[PDB]
């Protein structure tokens, strides 16, 4: 769509109306818009750095800055055909944001597919209210999930307590297991202790599933019988 002119210049056209006398009374917005001008450039703006990983956008390494033989043993003595092509488009293409955590988020849930069955709430409470010390995994205001493992891993890396991401990730994994075993034992023992004092529950999870299966299976029986009778004819 053509860059529109008549939405951002309402003040100028209104002032022409007022000066000519076509409009008698000044509108209520007139002085407000006069004191707060709209942005009227509507330009494409280049970018020179990827915000996420800090990679510089728009630098060409020269042959002088590659004085050493490449992996195939050949020196670089002249520019290649990629260096000679103007790369202005990269300056305007919105950069792809990248985080190592995402590679480490994919791994965790490949190693623990049943951690995907733990429901997650994506509704944020307030990102500014978070004050976490990742020296430990449990945090007040957070659940225990894969992100706890990964944030602890990143903490361990940035403090150089481990040099390799693999070892930090494994350490975080074992702390996560330590906490999960405690939680599951807490749940089981809480239920056991509740039953030992006369807690009378109604439908459990197993009975819930049984009743839903029954609801589905009744309709399935009816359809099967109807289809068999129809097929016979």
């Amino acid at each position: 769509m053509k860059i529109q002119t008549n939405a951002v210049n309402v003040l100028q056209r209104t002032s022409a109306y007022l000066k000519s006398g076509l409009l008698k009374e000044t509108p209520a917005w007139y002085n407000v818009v006069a004191s707060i001008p709209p942005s009227t450039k509507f330009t494409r703006e280049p970018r020179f750095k990827n915000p996420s990983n800090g990679h510089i956008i728009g630098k060409l390494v020269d042959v002088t800055e590659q004085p050493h033989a490449n992996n195939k043993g050949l020196y670089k003595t002249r520019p290649n055909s990629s260096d000679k092509r103007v790369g202005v488009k990269r300056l305007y293409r919105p950069p792809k944001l990248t985080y190592v955590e995402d590679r480490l988020r994919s791994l965790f849930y490949k190693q623990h597919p049943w951690e995907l069955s733990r429901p997650k709430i994506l509704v944020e409470n307030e990102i500014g209210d978070e004050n976490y010390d990742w020296s430990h995994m449990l945090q007040i205001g957070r659940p225990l999930d894969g992100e706890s493992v990964i944030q602890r891993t990143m903490y361990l890396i940035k403090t150089k307590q481990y040099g390799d991401m693999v070892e930090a990730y494994d350490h975080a994994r074992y702390e996560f297991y330590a906490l999960r075993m405690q939680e599951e034992t807490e749940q089981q023992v809480a239920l056991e202790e509740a039953e030992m004092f006369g807690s009378l529950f109604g439908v459990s999870a197993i009975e819930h599933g049984i009743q839903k299966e029954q609801e589905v299976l009744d309709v399935w029986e009816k359809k099967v019988v109807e289809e068999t009778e129809l097929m016979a004819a």
Binding site: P143, D145, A194, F197, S199, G202, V203
Partner: protein, 244 residues
């Protein structure tokens, strides 16, 4: 996050505890540490879930019927109970029982006096609560006040989680028949969650947990502690808890 509520006159509570019941280090154990401990555990058990948006009373009502969430229920119960108890022993926010409260005592406890019902409550707590629990004077939908003793973190609101019977030890056929009737009534509900209606509400709550009396009284002497509690209730709160 669940946070411990701020109490009226917190400075005096930290300096001199509750007069006639608790010392400063007793009230610190029962409220400024136990309630903090419970709120931290509830936060860790409900953070990142729906329950984090609900008050402990609503949490315990929501999780009362789900067997696997019992731990959350326990926390949500104790927290709630621990503030029902503290609130009605705090010095202030000379209070006396209202005419309506004593009238309902005479209409419930066979026309008995309040002191006699207090002694009955002492006896009930002494016998039917081995170890940890809660003592309640509760009002049912029949306008009847009766004494309820829960073990550990049973709730006074929802009868299937009262936990008024210790099934670790032997029980009388009367208690077993009561459990059978309650199980049948639970099964009688049509709701898929399997919940029932229960309009019982607590009027008086006493914390029989070791966090309340152990430091100031000792391993025994919980009867003395309960007596001190019931002789020194905040009757403004207790009178407000009864529907007019």
């Amino acid at each position: 996050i669940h946070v411990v509520p701020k109490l009226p006159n917190s400075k005096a509570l930290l300096q001199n505890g509750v007069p006639n019941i608790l010392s400063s280090s007793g009230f610190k154990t029962v409220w400024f540490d136990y309630q903090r401990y419970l709120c931290d555990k509830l936060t860790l058990a409900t953070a990142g879930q729906s329950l984090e948006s609900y008050y402990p009373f609503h949490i315990l009502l929501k999780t009362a019927g789900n067997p696997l969430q019992s731990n959350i229920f326990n926390l949500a119960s104790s927290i709630h109970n621990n503030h029902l108890f503290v609130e009605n022993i705090l010095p202030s926010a000379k209070t006396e029982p209202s005419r309506l409260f004593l009238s309902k005592i005479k209409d419930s406890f066979n026309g008995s006096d309040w002191e006699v019902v207090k002694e009955e409550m002492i006896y009930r707590a002494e016998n039917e609560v081995l170890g940890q629990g809660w003592l309640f004077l509760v009002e049912n939908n029949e306008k009847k006040l009766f004494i309820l003793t829960s073990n550990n973190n049973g709730t006074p609101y929802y009868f299937p989680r009262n936990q008024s019977f210790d099934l670790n030890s032997a029980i009388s056929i009367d208690e077993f028949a009561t459990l059978k009737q309650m199980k049948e009534l639970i099964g009688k509900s049509t709701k898929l969650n399997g919940k029932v209606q229960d309009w019982t509400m607590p009027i008086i709550c006493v914390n029989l947990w070791d966090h309340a009396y152990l430091h100031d009284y000792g391993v025994g002497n919980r009867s003395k502690y309960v007596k001190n509690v019931l002789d020194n209730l905040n009757w403004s709160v207790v009178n407000n808890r009864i529907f007019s």
